[PDB]
Amino acid sequence: LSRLGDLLFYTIAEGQERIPIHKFTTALKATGLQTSDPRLRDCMSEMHRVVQESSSGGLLDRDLFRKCVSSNIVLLTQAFRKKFVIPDFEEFTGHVDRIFEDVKELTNPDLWGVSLCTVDGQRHSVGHTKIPFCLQSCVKPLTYAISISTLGTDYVHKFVGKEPSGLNKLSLNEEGIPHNPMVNAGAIVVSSLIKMDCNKAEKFDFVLQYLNKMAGNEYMGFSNATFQSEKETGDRNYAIGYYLKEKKCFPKGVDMMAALDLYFQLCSVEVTCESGSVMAATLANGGICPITGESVLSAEAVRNTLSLMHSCGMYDFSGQFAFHVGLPAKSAVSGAILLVVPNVMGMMCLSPPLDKLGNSHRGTSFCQKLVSLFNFHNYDNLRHCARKLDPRREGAEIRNKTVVNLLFAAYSGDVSALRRFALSAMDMEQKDYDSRTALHVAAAEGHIEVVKFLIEACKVNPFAKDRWGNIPLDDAVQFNHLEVVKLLQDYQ
Amino acid sequence: LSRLGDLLFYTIAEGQERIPIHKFTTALKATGLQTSDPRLRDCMSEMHRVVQESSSGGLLDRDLFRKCVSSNIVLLTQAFRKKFVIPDFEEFTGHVDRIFEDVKELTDLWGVSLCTVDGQRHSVGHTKIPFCLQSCVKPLTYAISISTLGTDYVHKFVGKEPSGLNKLSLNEEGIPHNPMVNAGAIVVSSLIKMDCNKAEKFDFVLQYLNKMAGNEYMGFSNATFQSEKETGDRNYAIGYYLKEKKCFPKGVDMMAALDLYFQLCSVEVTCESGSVMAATLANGGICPITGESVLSAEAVRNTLSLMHSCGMYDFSGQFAFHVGLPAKSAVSGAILLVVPNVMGMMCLSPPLDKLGNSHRGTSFCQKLVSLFNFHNYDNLRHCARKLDPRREGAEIRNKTVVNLLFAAYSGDVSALRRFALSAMDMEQKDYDSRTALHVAAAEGHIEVVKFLIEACKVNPFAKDRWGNIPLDDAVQFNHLEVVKLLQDYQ
Amino acid sequence: LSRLGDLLFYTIAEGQERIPIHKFTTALKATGLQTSDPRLRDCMSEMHRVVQESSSGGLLDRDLFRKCVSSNIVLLTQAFRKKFVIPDFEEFTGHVDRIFEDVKEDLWGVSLCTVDGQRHSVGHTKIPFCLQSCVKPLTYAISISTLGTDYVHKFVGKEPSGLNKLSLNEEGIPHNPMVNAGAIVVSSLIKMDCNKAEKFDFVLQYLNKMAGNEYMGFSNATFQSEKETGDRNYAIGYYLKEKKCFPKGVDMMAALDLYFQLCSVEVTCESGSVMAATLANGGICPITGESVLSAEAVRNTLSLMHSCGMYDFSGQFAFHVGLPAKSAVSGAILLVVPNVMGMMCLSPPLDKLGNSHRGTSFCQKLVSLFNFHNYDNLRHCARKLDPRREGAEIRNKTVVNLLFAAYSGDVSALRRFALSAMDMEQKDYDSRTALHVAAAEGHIEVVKFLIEACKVNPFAKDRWGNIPLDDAVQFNHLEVVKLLQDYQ
Amino acid sequence: LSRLGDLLFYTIAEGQERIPIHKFTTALKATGLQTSDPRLRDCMSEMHRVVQESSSGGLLDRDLFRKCVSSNIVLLTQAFRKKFVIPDFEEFTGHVDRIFEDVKELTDLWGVSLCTVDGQRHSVGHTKIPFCLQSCVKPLTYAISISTLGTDYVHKFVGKEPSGLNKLSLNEEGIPHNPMVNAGAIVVSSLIKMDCNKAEKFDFVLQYLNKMAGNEYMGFSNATFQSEKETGDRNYAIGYYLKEKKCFPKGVDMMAALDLYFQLCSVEVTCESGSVMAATLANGGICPITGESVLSAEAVRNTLSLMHSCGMYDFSGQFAFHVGLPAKSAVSGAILLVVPNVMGMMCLSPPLDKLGNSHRGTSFCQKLVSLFNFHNYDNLRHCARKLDPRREGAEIRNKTVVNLLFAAYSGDVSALRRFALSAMDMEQKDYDSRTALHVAAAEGHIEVVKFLIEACKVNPFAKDRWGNIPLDDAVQFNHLEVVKLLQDYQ
């Protein structure tokens, strides 16, 4: 079949047929795809092989490119066709950069970093993003997602609730189970449901097996210093664990200290921001890892977890986060916040300083400045973006589209449609590709019934100069009609 | 001369030379839009006037058909291009009737209505029966307050988080928990323009509700206005407590403010009018069917966030999990529901459950979101077993002629190269009857014109109604270099 | 029938056989009874009649007593016989005066009425003040007696709240009559078929007998107020209306209105002190002896007044003071010392917990010095004084048993005194000790224990100058002399 | 001289010259005191010593009776003068057995024991069966802490007021609610001498409980000490939380604390031994039957105030109202009762109520207080329908010979005049063969002598043991005025 691989090369090769692979590496990082991306592992392999077989020793041509690429071409076109979920990435990251650099004033204070992974695998990172940190209680949804997928939607919720507590605060819901999996009592109970017929060592690696697919096989360590600690200092969880033992809310035939010990292992799992960003991007992508395409979690599992981060993710501040930011998140005592922008991207941030409610100061400030500028809120309308940008669509696409539809209804007499653009505060002064406007477009025919609304209602300035410098008065003379001309002399 | 405008006759007529009028109404009935649509009255009036007077009588020819449908081509092409949010409306509602009969088995007055953000309406069951907005005006009242006053001012007198486990409870700030309970509904109702009498105050809010509703039916039932003022024991109890704590603003009478909340609760609507108000919240503060900016952007966002969390009283938490759509219920048996960026809905079933929410309504909503991929945190792309009627497929952001002409204006050849990969045809013409070539020729971009003539094999002999050859336009701009290259083609 | 009336005159008249009645007034105020006492009403009319008729012009002899004095003799002897519940009253009030003046370091007063009718007042006790929420126990007592214990508590609880405070108990009724919700409900249980004017006087009828017909005013300025400002109670009343916790066929606005009348009832400290002495007694007023309240009405009111009476000191007051009390925003506290006395205090300055500063400080200093706490042991008073018994009563009694046990050779009993921290160096009327008693009888085992265990000082000198060694010469016993010679 | 001990023979013997021993056993059994009473052992030994080593055997003559009882007359006379707090003991317990049978029809271990503050003991039912003080040691532990440490120190680490909210929490200051719930019981156990090992810690408290009990039976059941350490999930949950919040003092570990608290909870007593510990709280920190100052005055006051409100778990509010006595219950089925200044009591019945109190034991307490005036706010004098065996009406402050002698010493004639009003004879005498006149004669008060000689006609020449006529003392003191007045009689 005459596959479009040659067409891909033509877009890449603006000039001669012989292009270096070094030039192919750039314009692939422009789309925010790293050279080391797993999704294109089978592509870069043959590119390095050709250094010896080819006489030119590096200068790729059109024919050789087709053979190396394969059924994965569909993903390869999408990157250069700008059909990912965030085109104009170079500008998008630049705005993520200015937000990041702005909050430096807001007070290891030097530790300050944020990373992000788009649902299409596109990614960017700024600041100290490669300093590992523990997922201190950030693994509660990860554990809950693993349990709910493998066991069933009802089984996991016979033993823990699905709605917040409203007040730490060791207590149970009305039914006799912990309020939600986002608190210690629920996180401990759900942790005890995973692989109940296995030992401590085997259970931990099975859960950790689900990680590194959630994380796309970036770094995932199991630190011991945090594991030895928090077992001597885990009095809060010992109190919860014994309380949960007393209230008999564990499953039948389950050890309690063993369940606690596994829970302490998970909290000690150490990740960087880059690996953290790729994590929860699989949550955005509905249980399928973006950076590799592996189906990690079930469809319901990623639905249930995201609703719970919205409710209980940020502890006491969850109510305000659900209002000012309206994104699922999960915070840690380490000073790092997990963030999910469903259908768009996943993001993780790091700043050690922490505010009174268990959340980072810079981290929460960053999430606020972000949603305020990029239409990310859950109930922000996608069509009427207002001053907020929509990275889901390439820049100026909506701005140019509105003009073309506005100018379209010249001669058929669609008077009514003009009202909605005007009454929606849409600017009538926008100039199209040829410097035309609905006033210029309609003023050519000289039928007063249409242009009458524009002057009377919109009060639009008719003194604008087109690219040719001609005024509609000359156009009317060019079309042999004088009646409309009388109205034109008015307004001054 | 003939172009995409004309196909409206061909697609409806199947090429038939003359069509009956009832075909157009039946065809237009599909795709959702109703004959009485505020944006289609021109066609209805223009249809009856000429047809009954013209000698042609009950037959529509091409010239006759074009002018009658000429008034609303932007909507009619949108409806017939299937550019609406739900282009499978004939079958999307076909699902809704089977679910409607399904909830009958579980448990006389049962009706549901819907209205998409593009104005597509459907209704089944007793949807015309009026009923009182007992509690559904709480978001609507709160939305009005945000727009004129603001979120910072409105929330000094009320919180923004669920209360949980129940009156006479306040947050740590000394204000009611949120505007979605009786306590918070009173305080926001008091905030609305405390400088005019009660009667004018009611009509101000009633004016918004009609604009939010888009001028469909509304009522002000006095048989519930008085029957509550003589029975609102809990409301009176709440009101007295608020003024003790100085919760109301300065210079506000509790009895007047507490009477206004009673006036609004007594407003009467149907499923049809209510669904449009819901669809006004889905559409970001613009009526789907009349296109006015009734509300501010920040108002509807705050309204939906609180409707999601605090909407359904005690069942709010479970509803945000199984269904995840902002909603609001009332003792009358009606559930308001908002699907952001998609549609709005309203149900009605007088029987209720122990938690104060309608059983058929909540049964219907659960059976809906489980099938149509509408949950807030359900994902696009990976629909799983759920149907996704928001798009037949491909992309709603596919190739268009607009990006070319502005790409030519800006000199972004790379975008043109990206468009070239999609086997895009350059022959699609707007008013210009010109491809991207002229704009680059006018600008003088040397690389763009060379790319277009060679890479795409564009016709240089394209005519235009304005009567100027592309070479002539370049002459005024002194693009001498462009002249030589273009002339070399022949 | 040789009645003991003439014996009363002899103790009253230490001198000649004809005494002026002016001297009878004094020594009747020393016992803390006022000349205006209702119990001796008939006496006052009779005494003044013969002051003018008698040729002596006031002098009173024995023969008059047997005729004019009457059934009130049994009470009249009780005052001079010191058989009331608080003898040595002149010293007792001096300490209450001491506490009063001490807490000072402009309106400040306290009054007290003993359960036997005895009474004292100091400060600004005569300035009237409203009875704001101090009527809550009084209305509950009136309601609980007339209706029944089961009826009144179908509609209000008997439990505290420990938390304004708008909520109901688990059963669906307000927690207790000591809160506004419970206080308003009990108000609605009184005289179902009567009107606002008739109900209020029937309740006020009880209050007048409660106070022994002392001043009972119904101010209007506070009644007009608290109906405009009663939003808290309107909120409660409508709340109680909504919850349907009122009795069948009862209007809510009227029940609220009656409640506002009671709070506006105005009393002085003197009148308020006689109040809380009726229910210090078992529903019998001391100053009149009339049965005001039922037996199982003062038991319930005091139990609830202890639990819930004070507002936020309730837990601490039941610990540091342990007395039923009720406080008001006016700055006045009602006190009950069951079986002892009633009491009321006044100081406007009110602390952050809704209770008076000087008032609560006074109750602290009082109970700390006078054995009034509920679980203070009566027999082992420690450093706390006991007004129930006259001074030097137990102290002298312990000496006699300590010295008498020595005579019997009761060595075992002597262990209890010493090991109970009691001072064994106590001197009797004639300066003897147990060592002296044992020395006389020659109980060798007794004297040995005192020297070894008690370490008694042998330097004690009797009034005659005799030393225990000298008594040996009187009776000529040798064996104990050798033991006595030791220890020095 | 005629010592009062002879009257004890006459009243027991009814004037009979010779008494059998078995008569005395029943006679002393009445008035409450048991043969094994620590304060009556000397009489019992001397009673048995002569009987088994004399020809007379089991018979007591007057001289034999006087010398044997001489060591214990002050308590034996108290028992036979009916000076005990319950002089009607033979019938007071006769009531207790009928109530005992009446409650013994509800739904078997059922036993009750009592001990008065004067050491009168009675028991009925299975009172000898031991059981563990599961929760009843909470007041006892708290009392020990107050005495050595103080109320200010002990309550820095625990509040002093109930909770009403089983519920791991803290009142308002980062400390447990009260020492009567499991959370507060643990903190006080940690406060007791945190400078020595666990085992010595247990025996220090056990030493107090022996003295509070007065040396009756106690046990240390290890089958409950271990069975709670391997099952005390609630206690471990509470303990872990306390150290997180730094509620324990400095230099304390939760490991030791729960070990001690389970040791104390596992101490074993019977109804008899427990009742005396209760009666030790009645008598203000002194054992009734042995007279040791085990506790401080402020310790038992604080203990009883907290036992009143917090003693029962959730039935306490309804218990402080219907019964009003300080009490304490345990899962074993035993209720500890303290009737201040009267007696202590302990019950035992395994089956419980919904709130963890014994059904057959709690009904008995209500049926008791309803009949015997013991409610904290029942009134003396006006007993209503309730029996009052405390003093059956009489004045405890009745006239005595002691007041005359000390009144004579101080010269307060008015007190003597008050005594004279009662027609009482001033010839009542102490051991020393001296009436009030001798004391007055020694002092030389002129007015007192005139009152005594005439108001009562008392002999002034009565002989005395000390062997000197009072006139001779006056002659020694040169009270010439007294001489002539005294001589005027002859």
Author numbering:
A (entry chain B): 69 to 175, 190 to 249, 252 to 576
B (entry chain C), D (entry chain D): 69 to 175, 192 to 249, 252 to 576
C (entry chain A): 69 to 173, 192 to 249, 252 to 576
What does the article say, verbatim?
Here we demonstrate that the ability of GAC and GLS2 to form filaments is directly coupled to their catalytic activity and present their cryo-EM structures which provide a view of the conformational states essential for catalysis. Filament formation guides an ‘activation loop’ to assume a specific conformation that works together with a ‘lid’ to close over the active site and position glutamine for nucleophilic attack by an essential serine.
The stretch of residues Gly248-Glu258, which has been shown to play an essential role in catalysis and thus referred to as the ‘activation loop'23,34, is disordered and flexible in the GLS2 structure. In addition, residues Tyr182-Lys188 in GLS2, which correspond to a loop in KGA and GAC forming a ‘lid’ that needs to close over bound substrates for catalysis to occur, are also flexible like the activation loops in the GLS2 structure. The C-terminal region of GLS2 contains an ankyrin repeat motif consisting of three pairs of helical bundles located on the distal ends of the tetramer, which is absent in GAC. Interestingly, the ankyrin repeats asymmetrically occupy the area between the N-terminus of adjacent monomeric units within a dimer, showing a preferential association for one monomer over the other.
